[PDB]
Amino acid sequence: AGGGVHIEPRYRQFPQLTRSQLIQAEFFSATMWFWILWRFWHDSDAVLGHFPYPDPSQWTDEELGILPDDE
Amino acid sequence: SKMELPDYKQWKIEGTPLETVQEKLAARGLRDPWGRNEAWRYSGGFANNVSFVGALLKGFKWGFAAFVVAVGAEYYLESQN
Amino acid sequence: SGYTPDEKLRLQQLRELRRRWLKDQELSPREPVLPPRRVWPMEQFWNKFLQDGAPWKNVIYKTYRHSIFAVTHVLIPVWIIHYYLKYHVTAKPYTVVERKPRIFPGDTILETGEVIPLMKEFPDQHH
Amino acid sequence: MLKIIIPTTMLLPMTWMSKHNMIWINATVHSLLISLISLSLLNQLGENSLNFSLTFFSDSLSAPLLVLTTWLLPLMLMASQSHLSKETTTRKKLYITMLILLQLFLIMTFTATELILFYILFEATLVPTLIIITRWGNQTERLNAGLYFLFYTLAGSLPLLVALVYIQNTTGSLNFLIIHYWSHPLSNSWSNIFMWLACIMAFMVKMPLYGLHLWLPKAHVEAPIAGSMVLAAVLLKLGGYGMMRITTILNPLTNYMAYPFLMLSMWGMIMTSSICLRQTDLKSLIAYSSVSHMALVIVAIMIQTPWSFMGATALMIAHGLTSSMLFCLANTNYERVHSRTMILARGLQTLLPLMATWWLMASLTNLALPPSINLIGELFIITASFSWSNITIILMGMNMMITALYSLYMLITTQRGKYTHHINNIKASFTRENALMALHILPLLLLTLNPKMILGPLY
Amino acid sequence: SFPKYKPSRLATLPATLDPAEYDISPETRKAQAERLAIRSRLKREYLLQYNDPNRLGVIEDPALIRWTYARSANIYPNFRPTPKTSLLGALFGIGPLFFWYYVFKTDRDKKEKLIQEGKLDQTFNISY
Amino acid sequence: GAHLARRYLGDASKEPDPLRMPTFPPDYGFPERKEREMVATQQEMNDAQLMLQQRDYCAHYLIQLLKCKRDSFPNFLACKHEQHDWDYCEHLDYVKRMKEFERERRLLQRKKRREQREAEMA
Amino acid sequence: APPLTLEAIKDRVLYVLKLYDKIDPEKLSVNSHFMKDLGLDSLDQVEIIMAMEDEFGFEIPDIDAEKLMCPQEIVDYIADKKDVYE
Amino acid sequence: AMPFTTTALIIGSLALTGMPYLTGFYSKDLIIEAVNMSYTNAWALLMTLIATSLTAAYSTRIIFFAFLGKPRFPPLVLINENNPLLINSIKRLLIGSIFAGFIISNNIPPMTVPNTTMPLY
Amino acid sequence: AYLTHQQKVLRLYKRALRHLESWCVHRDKYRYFACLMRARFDEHKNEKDMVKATQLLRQAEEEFWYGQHPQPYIFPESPGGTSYERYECYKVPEWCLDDWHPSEKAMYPDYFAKREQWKRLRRESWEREVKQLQEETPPGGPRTEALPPARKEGDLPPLWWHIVTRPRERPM
């Protein structure tokens, strides 16, 4: 309210963006990449899909076991 | 820092992208009625921000460092065991 | 765009009458004088250890205030909810019904000591 | 029950002879003390009604209403302080005499053991209320107010007189206990439905149902501030006691005969709620909301269900408390503004910080929100009506849909927003008011914490 | 062309786009006349007694209590039993009445002939 | 998906109906049906307080997991081998369900082929 | 949040509305009557009327668009509306 | 001039649009693969991916509007998160929005349907 | 009084791009669309026949309504905004000081002393301003909404208490 403001305004100039609140923001900025990519390296499987899609129209007639196709 | 008012003659249209639209209205045959109060809002101090992905890539080179540190962590875990 | 001598006179006179009014709204040095009240001598000692305001004294008063908040708000509530609970609540039946922990094939019991047999032959589907 | 009645009767010479300015003090103090003696009557032995003599008996149905009336008498007593400070000493003592006689007749009605005595004191309430409304009223239409109230109540009551003397001639007695124990099935004979109508319509008259609800709106508006709460509070519930006791002989004919009035209440409690979104007067607003609540209690009675009876028994007390609660606020704002227009003064919270707080929990109690006894009394009726006829919840949901739309609307258009710039005589709230709504709202939650007492006689 | 705006009783055509409000005849320009005069004089009263230190109390116009009367008591003396009035008054005086009565008695008899032989279930509904 | 395209977009009968699947005898070309071996036991998993939704054949790999989960605190990175056994069992059961679906699918194509070549053979 | 002191909005009006380069600053003044002192009608006012109000964080009344013409009028209305009294 | 809020907003936007390993992965991502898996209403199925697309849309709308790079505001620059307590609270919720997405997803007892295999598309 | 052609077109110009800036957001896009030649308003200043002026008004005013946002720009303090009536909660009329009590009266003493002689000035000014307003009031109910000034020295303007003692826009 009174004089001597911390971000005391130079007219139309950058209001002293403290680089400390910058460097903590970059701590968390590196932490988001941490959580997206060291989790990827730790277990890519979560976003990879484990096991594959066994496309039905590629299999054999024994495990499917149709009664003789000629019959 | 009590009201560091700057000179007005310095913050004019020249150099700023508002000159291009000033050229545009020059094609229209006109002069900008206000095109100077925002010269600061075109200078690199507050204008010219990083891209939206660039904003998303907030220090992603530190993420590339995380690449190596995590890979080496698992590599020395497996190598010595 | 028709500002007659009438209402420019009216308007700037209202302006600086209100300016004088606000200059009289400035509370004098003695204002906003408050009356004497009762301050606690223990908190008086704690405050007198913060006028110098060394970081260790600041931290010490911080943890003392957190300590009195804890004693009045953490274990004071458990002083009487436990008395109500294990002596009055549990004095009446079916008040605190707890879900039975998941008894497991292969776990022994503290009192009887018997163990339920472990799960039978797995398919052994190795990865 | 002489223990509580005799102090009230003999209290009268005290007020009628004490000093010109100690009468207020002495009447107040002795009212609080006879209310203290009254709350000792909350005890109820098993299922037996608390008998006292051949003529006086009480039970769990009665006791909350008795201690209610005893608790109120101080309330309008010290609410009268503002409005009667300028009138003559003898008229002041006469006003206190009217209030005391009214309370005496109420506690006589509620403790009545035989029917016709209950009826005599049932009509004995009009005389003090009529006198209070007509003499100490404020505006002009108070005369037509007294006419409407008196004539409506009588036109209801006389058929009940003929019916009661007929019951005495036929059955052999009018004592409550015997006619409950010697009850017989009221058959579907074409004389029996007129018997039922005579025994019911009287109580229905002073329980304003849809259509026959003009006396309350046209009387409570300009009734004296002390009187208005008394009308809105108790004499709508002595009729409820009347139904509570007379329905023991009206079965099983009540099973299908109640249908016309029954629905006339449910749709009724919507219309008087639907009317309740648009009122030019705040007193009329409270009166119409009251009418909605009594339509609710009416449908509570007519189902003849123990849960319906519990919801009712709670509802008379809850509604009376909240209605008088709001009427006190209406009195206070009117007395400060000397008018009763709805949107005359919005945004009163900017001037009276605690008064609109009082408004806030007053409306909240009007909302019937849990765990307040208003909600529990309503809720028992919800359950009973559902078990009665499934769909009833649709109409009653419309009622628990309109109630808050008008209650909080009254807040936003009285306390919230901003003050109207013309009025400038609104002084700081006097401790008399806020004290009286304190004694009104705090016990409303106190007895909420102990709902067994007011829960009902079928417990 | 550009989508033309039409008036409505709920969403009135905005003042700018009515045709006649830009077609003001000089008769209308005179017709507005000195309504600002009488309005400003009513202000003059209001601000006078408001700024008057001698006055201290509620100040109210006839305008408000005119509407109060005409919304509360003026209804009946000027009310006439027109055919329309009787028609719609009876309409919603016995339509919802008998309609709710009908639906309620319908469901009540539904359960009545569903319980006398035992179709309806009363297994856990003891707390009726 | 191909199944919806064949059924919903194309001939509904030609592809299995989800609300109907399966509608066929279990030994549809599957003589001597040895039903799947009982390794999951209802009493054990009721004792484990399992959800009825997950009380499938794979239950054996679920119950064991809880054992380690009961003995792993404080740790959430433990209990991996048997939980990966459960993951592989959920894989085998998902391929089991979809392969039974494709089994009765090609058997439904067999149904149309069969009723068109043995009944409409005239 | 500043009190927007008379000197604060005073600086505002020597940057805005002294932003006007259509008129050279030598004839520009805080009492400048743009219609004849500068030769441009209230027309070539309204546009910048909309600009300056976008800066101060306030809305000039649409009814008060006319007659609101000189820098002295700007500080006048800003001071009375923003209770610029310090 | 609003860096910390920028990073927080970007990662929150990615989270509500199902960021892997984040809160979004064990969230709408899971629910979407479940609704695609489980027998669900068709129109609901297509609608929920349209919803995910719109969730990306407006989440990046605030991104390319607020932090776009063209200043438009009062001449006195007040955009500044210098309050230490504001930073503390924002980061207190921020760590949860980074960590607590998975600091509860695998710790919980196995409680949902474990559909592991499924069509790649 | 009557809104004239000049006032109508001024309001239309004010509302036209307040609006269009919200259409374009970016200030470069602003400046372009505003300089979509501004002389588009001035290209047809020669409208000596006011009938054609009214017809082009039918085009101008009744083209804005659909070139304008269904959700246009509003300012906080502007009506329909965020802070138009936000601070009315904390504002209190000036007469709410007389009800104060000797404890509070002496606990801000000199403030109430200054209010005392301010209301004394009100006392000495009321009769002067009413006698000044009655003498110069034309018959039939003034003539406009313009309020007469204080023509003398040391006197006060008519009806001056309310617009001065009104609560500040930042009462907190």
Swiss-Prot record, chain D:
Predominant place of localization: mitochondrion
Catalytic activity entry: a ubiquinone + NADH + 5 H(+)(in) = a ubiquinol + NAD(+) + 4 H(+)(out)
Keywords from the named record: Electron transport, Membrane, Mitochondrion, Mitochondrion inner membrane, NAD, Respiratory chain, Translocase, Transmembrane, Transmembrane helix, Transport, Ubiquinone
GO biological process, one term: electron transport coupled proton transport
Topology in the lipid bilayer: Multi-pass membrane protein
Keyword Nucleotide-binding applies: no
Cystine pairings recorded for this chain: none
Entry's transmembrane regions: 22-42, 60-80, 98-118, 147-167, 193-213, 224-244, 257-277, 284-303, 308-330, 351-371, 391-413, 435-455
Gene Ontology CC entries for this record: mitochondrial inner membrane; respiratory chain complex I
Pfam assignment, any one: Proton_antipo_M
E.C. no: 7.1.1.2
Record-stated family: Belongs to the complex I subunit 4 family.
Subunit structure and binding partners: Core subunit of respiratory chain NADH dehydrogenase (Complex I) which is composed of 45 different subunits.
Free-text function comment from the UniProt entry: Core subunit of the mitochondrial membrane respiratory chain NADH dehydrogenase (Complex I) which catalyzes electron transfer from NADH through the respiratory chain, using ubiquinone as an electron acceptor. Essential for the catalytic activity and assembly of complex I.
Protein name: NADH-ubiquinone oxidoreductase chain 4
Organism this protein belongs to: Sus scrofa
Gene: MT-ND4
From Swiss-Prot, chain H:
Subcellular location field: Mitochondrion inner membrane
Membrane spanning residue stretches: 2-22, 43-65, 93-113
Subunit organization: Core subunit of respiratory chain NADH dehydrogenase (Complex I) which is composed of 45 different subunits.
Known function: Core subunit of the mitochondrial membrane respiratory chain NADH dehydrogenase (Complex I) which catalyzes electron transfer from NADH through the respiratory chain, using ubiquinone as an electron acceptor. Essential for the catalytic activity and assembly of complex I.
Assigned protein family: Belongs to the complex I subunit 5 family.
Protein name as it appears in the record: NADH-ubiquinone oxidoreductase chain 5
Organism encoding this protein: Sus scrofa (Pig)
This protein's encoding gene: MT-ND5
Residues of the full protein shown: 365 to 485 of 606
